[PDB]
Amino acid sequence: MNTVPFTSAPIEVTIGIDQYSFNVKENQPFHGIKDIPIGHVHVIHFQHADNSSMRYGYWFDCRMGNFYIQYDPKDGLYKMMEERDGAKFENIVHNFKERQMMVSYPKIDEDDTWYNLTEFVQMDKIRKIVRKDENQFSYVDSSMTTVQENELSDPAHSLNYTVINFKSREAIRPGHEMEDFLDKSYYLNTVMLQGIFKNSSNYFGELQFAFLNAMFFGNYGSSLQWHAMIELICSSATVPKHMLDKLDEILYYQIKTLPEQYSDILLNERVWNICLYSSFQKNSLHNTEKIMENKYPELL
């Protein structure tokens, strides 16, 4: 059970830790989050009370180092930092715990939600999508654009999601135009799975990461990537049976977790209608079709 101490909380802020969130008051004696489950990536995220613009946050894995948050009054944000001195860090956390100035990661024992959302998400893959190699943790915010968005402008601050484009030479073999456009199996299985991702676990990890960035930060490019990776599978006639079963589970937990009031901006009508009702896999996503029909029948 790992800990992310906070130096202080000088500005009023809503703090997220994975799917949970807490309001902290200006100069409230808040000194961090304890009992963070080992074995998963986590995201700690912020929305300032005075500027509900720029949700931002940090993907991290407590197995990779000792991380803490400290407010920077110059850049005006809560920054994640690594403490390289083990004994200083242990002594900081022990003191804050003894004074009970930390919130406890509020996981219910029965509750597999976070595992279910991050099953395939690895820090090493996050750090290749979010390039800042001097840190072990990854900063994301509402405004960061994707490599794909940038092609259609500061490359250092980009989300390097795998570019998916259904009307690209990558997606379409010369001489198989109609075949490859109407059945994306070539593109899914040869180009993306065998060629780029190497396996379905890496593909799902990027899909899950894109969703979480869309949900937690309202990152529009992330939402585009999540939908494109769903659509590429649903538009393929030939998908491994384990992949379809796993996709159905992944999407079910994503749709279950999405705030009801954000379905309007986070769910693409065309993609979901095509995926559940027209696509090759219209009948392969039973759990997802059932939760979508009971939670968001308007969209459909």
Binding site: K167, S168, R169, I172, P174, E177, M178, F181, L182
Partner: protein, 237 residues
């Protein structure tokens, strides 16, 4: 974006462009089977690919053999159209390749875009214009070469005959679209108007009769009359 009434003169500028009409690619007769079910029998079709500035028509004849043993033919017909237009562009010298291809039907956009990925600088555009190119098969000489084809064939025409010697490509296109609109609205009447006077013939190397400038004005008047009448009937107005 879309080609409309606003940007109509763009058709007659010096940027090579082609219209592509796929209406006549997949043609069938619907008939009863012995068992009283319904079946289709394909007939020869054609891609209508037209340079509106020069009148150069690339009539790719679609022989019924291309449909043999294929499924979802109305879908295939769009992709076959896109394949053949892509093949035509690749066959043209670079300086003859179009900068834009305008499709008369929006369903041709994705098929043509995917076939033309190798040509990212050729713009594929829809049009808001309701162009009467479906009536191409009412031009006797084009109908004849399509129906007689025993194999896939490309036939080259100038759909304006020698009109550009006397009129601009704006006026030539306006005459063509009026003639085709007439032929589309009442084929029998339109053909009657075009041939009624036996002294005005079609040259062996032409599609339309050899009208004088004055005879064209009469003809064009008679076509406008035909179109307005028909319209009053269609709508009772």
């Amino acid at each position: 974006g879309a080609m409309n009434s606003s940007n109509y003169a763009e058709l007659f500028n010096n940027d090579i462009k082609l219209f592509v009409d796929d209406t006549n690619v997949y043609r069938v007769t619907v008939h009863k089977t012995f068992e009283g079910n319904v079946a289709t029998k394909a007939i020869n079709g054609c891609i209508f690919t037209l340079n509106p500035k020069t009148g150069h028509l690339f009539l790719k004849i679609i022989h019924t053999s291309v449909w043999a043993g294929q499924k979802r033919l109305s879908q295939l017909a769009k992709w076959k159209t896109a394949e053949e237009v892509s093949a035509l562009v690749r066959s043209l010298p670079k300086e003859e390749q179009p900068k834009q291809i305008i499709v008369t039907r929006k369903a041709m956009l994705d098929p043509l875009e995917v076939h033309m990925l190798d040509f990212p600088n050729i713009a594929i555009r829809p049009t808001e214009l309701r162009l009467p190119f479906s009536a191409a098969m009412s031009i006797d000489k084009l109908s004849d070469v399509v129906m007689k084809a025993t194999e896939p064939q490309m036939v080259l025409f100038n759909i304006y005959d020698d009109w550009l010697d006397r009129i601009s490509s704006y006026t030539a296109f306006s005459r063509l679209t009026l003639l085709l609109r007439a032929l589309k609205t009442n084929e029998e009447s339109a053909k009657m108007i075009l041939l009624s006077d036996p002294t005005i013939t079609i040259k062996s190397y032409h599609l339309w009769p050899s009208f004088t400038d004055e005879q064209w004005i009469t003809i064009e008047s008679q076509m406008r009359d035909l179109i307005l009448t028909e319209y009053g009937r269609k709508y009772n107005v």
